Amino acid sequence: PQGRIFIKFLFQELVNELGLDELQLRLNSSKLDGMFPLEGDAEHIRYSINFFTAIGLGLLTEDMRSRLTIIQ
């Protein structure tokens, strides 16, 4: 949970310079897998999407939101 806060500050700083625009491009091109699961394991995707929506941004989670409906 302390580490969770760490991530929170990490992206909340990393946004302000890029502006959530360049963010999506970099991430989508950065092939982050374990952090952004598309492969399966629904509950984990619920934790990811719910987490970024807890940060207050959540606009990185759309591609995963699709995979929620695909799992259900």
Partner 1 sequence: PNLLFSMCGFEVRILPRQRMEEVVSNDEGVWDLVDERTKQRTAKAYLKV
Handedness of CA 21, 23, 25, 28 (dihedral sign): negative
- CB of 26 vs partner 1, minimal distance in Å: 14
Site membership for partner 1, residue 55 (CB under 8 A) = no
* 52-to-33, 40, 47, 69 alpha-carbon distances in Å: 16, 18, 9, 18
The first and second tokens of residue 23, run together, are 């963010």
For partner 1, the closer CB: 19 or 34: 19
Question: Can you tell me which of 5, 17, 35, 69 binds partner 1, judged by CB under 8 A?
Answer: 17
- CB–CB of 20/57 below 8 Å? yes
Site membership for partner 1, residue 16 (CB under 8 A) = yes
Site membership for partner 1, residue 19 (CB under 8 A) = yes
Interface ranges with partner 1 (CB under 8 A): 15-17, 19-20
